[PDB]
Structure formats: C-alpha cells, structure tokens
Design a protein around this ligand. Structure first.
Ligand SMILES: CNc1nc(Cl)nc2c1cnn2C
Ligand SMILES: [Mg+2]
Ligand SMILES: [Zn+2]
Length: 344
C-alpha cells in the first residue's frame, strides 16, 4: 500500500518521427489543455514534440536518439505512488511549455533559464517514494543520512537522480556542451529542483510578494531567480489551474498518498501530521487551506507579473469556491472505502 515499484534498474520513438504539437491535440498549446488526458504511452513522444516546438533540439544541436534515450530514462526514473509519479512530472513539464507559448518568457528570462526550467520540470520529482522530507528523517532512511543536515532531503535526491541520468551511457543530452555551459545547466537545475520544496516557498514568499509590489527587471541577474522559483512552483501546482474535475482527482491522489504515509507512521508507533491521518483529515477544509495559503497567492503573484496569466488565478479561485460549495456533500474524514471522490 506504501510499496511503490521502480520498473527497472526507443526506436519506435524515432522510426515513427517527432510529431507536430497540433497532431497530438489542437488544444495542446492552451491553458485549457489537460495533459493528464494524454495516454501514458504517448507522453515520451509529447516531450520530444514540445522540445522541437520550443526549438530546443535545433538551438542546442541535441542528438535525437540520445534525447529519446534520456526521456525514456527520466520516465523510468519515477515510481508509482498515487501522485508523485511520471504523469505528474509530464503534466508539470507541459505547463512549463504552456508558460513559454502563452507568456512571453523570453522577455523576462534568458533562453538557458527556460530550457533548464523544462528539463528540471521533467526531473523535479525523480525517484519520489510517496513520502515527505519529515518521513525520511523519522524512518532514518539512506536519503536522510545523506541530506537531512543540509535540508530539503527529497529535492537534493531528485537532482542527484537527474545528474545520474546525465552520467548514463547514451543519455547525456548535454554531452556536446562546453564545460562552461554544461556547468551552467547543472547549477540552474539544482536551484530550480530545490525551489520545489514548499518549506523553501514559505521562506521566499516575503521576497516574492515584495518583487510583485515594486515590479520586475530583465537585465537584473538576480530578479530571474525569484522568478524561476515562482514559475517552478507554478508548474508544480498547475493541476489547480485546470477544471474542477482535475482538482477533485488530484485531491483524491495526493490524499491517498498522504494517508499511506500516515498508516506507515502509525505502524512505526509515531503520530502522523493531521493531513496524513485518514482518521483526522477532512479533505475539503485541507484543500481550501492549501488553495488559500499556498496556490492562490502564487497564481495572484504570477498575474501581477504577467497580465495574460489572469485566467490561471481566476480558475484557481473558482476551483476553491467549488470546494467550499461541495463540502456540504462531504461529511466524512479521510477517503471513502473505494478511495474515490467521483461521487462529489
Ligand atoms: C505539492 N502539491 C500539493 N498539491 C495539493 Cl492538491 N495539495 C497539497 C500539495 C502539498 N500539500 N498539499 C495539501
Ligand atoms: Mg517534489
Ligand atoms: Zn512535483
């Protein structure tokens, strides 16, 4: 139940050819697209198509068989917990592509900062175990021994797995890069992946909110850092910007994952956080708190920096209103016996 499998320890992706984005879906480059609707078997092809459409394969002379290998490795690098799996990384990468297509990202960040955001989105949760940073420490895992004294245990592990993929035979997509440009990529990936820790978001919100108040700067080497942090978090929480049904399904997956951790903590004789205890958690209230405290403030800041991002904030606020309206038809704590929220 808390046991999540790793599948392991290519020609059919190139013999067919890289697909133009509209052949995947006419609505593929829209904020109304639901990347989770795409069959899992088609996602590797979609990543190639997005890189081809953002003109990253040509601008960096990436070897297509190597890119095909790297994408398959990154995909295989994910376990199967209910939420922190490959489909999550794929949908997060798709939102990065949507930000590129819809917001004028080049007018705010360097091209290398955008290509690193996409590759980081693909890698940001590699080898996630369906448990948070506190559980790593409590279970005295190999990852906590390695990174707990440094902070952000899982995030440092995700970055280490990405680097290990880049050091695998025929998977180094940055192999032709100069030593100066190979190192620039690694550094942006470390900071971008580390920004996915929500504890890091609580620490930089005061700086985020102030940058939104004063206003952004493009020649400023720093401003690009608080922005990369906000944009990475925007991709990570992008399921909140979709329809009510996506938000409902994501709540169902993240709480199924949280409650499995809770049950493991109880089995170790420890008391889990309220939100991870199936006997204490009230999903609608927890979802509304997360939307009010975490998600909405992020999308509101994104709107403050990019006017065209207003539709995203509006959808998050609308989804939160829907959760308040339906809480009446949700009287129980935890999840139903079938682990489904389809009844709402
Ligand atoms: C990180 N992504 C998340 N997505 C959703 Cl729907 N709820 C969350 C998190 C983190 N905490 N909670 C309550
Ligand atoms: Mg993560
Ligand atoms: Zn994630």
């Amino acid at each position: 139940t808390s046991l999540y499998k790793k599948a392991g320890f290519y020609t059919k992706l190139l013999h067919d050819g890289i697909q133009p984005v509209a052949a995947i879906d006419s609505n593929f480059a829209s904020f109304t697209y639901t990347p989770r609707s795409l069959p899992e078997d088609d996602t590797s092809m979609a990543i190639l198509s997005m890189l081809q459409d953002m003109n990253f394969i040509n601008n960096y002379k990436i070897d297509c068989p190597t890119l095909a290998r790297f994408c398959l490795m990154v995909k295989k690098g994910y376990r199967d917990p209910p939420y922190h799996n490959w489909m999550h990384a794929f949908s997060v990468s798709h939102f990065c592509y949507l930000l590129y297509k819809n917001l004028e990202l080049t007018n705010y960040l360097e091209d290398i900062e955008i290509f690193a955001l996409f590759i980081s989105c693909m890698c940001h949760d590699l080898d996630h175990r369906g448990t948070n940073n506190s559980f790593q420490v409590a279970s005295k895992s190999v990852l906590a021994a390695l990174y707990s004294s440094e902070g952000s245990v899982m995030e440092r592990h995700h970055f280490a797995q990405a680097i290990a993929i880049l050091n695998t035979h025929g998977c180094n997509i940055f192999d032709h890069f100069s030593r100066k440009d190979y190192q620039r990529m690694l550094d942006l990936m470390r900071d971008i992946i580390l920004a996915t820790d929500l504890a890091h978001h609580l620490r930089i919100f005061k700086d985020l909110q102030k940058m939104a108040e004063v206003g952004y700067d493009r020649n400023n080497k720093q401003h690009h850092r608080l922005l990369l942090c906000l944009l990475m978090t925007s991709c990570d929480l992008s399921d909140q910007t979709k329809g009510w049904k996506t938000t409902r399904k994501i709540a169902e997956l993240i709480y199924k994952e949280f409650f499995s951790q809770g049950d493991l903590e109880k089995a170790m004789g420890n008391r889990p956080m309220e939100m991870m205890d199936r006997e204490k958690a009230y999903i609608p209230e927890l979802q509304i708190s997360f939307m009010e405290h975490i998600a909405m403030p992020i999308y509101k800041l994104l709107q403050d920096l990019f006017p065209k991002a207003a539709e995203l904030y509006e959808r998050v606020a609308s989804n939160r209103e829907h959760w308040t309206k339906v809480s009446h038809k949700f009287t129980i704590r935890g999840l139903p016996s079938n682990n489904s929220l389809d009844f709402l």
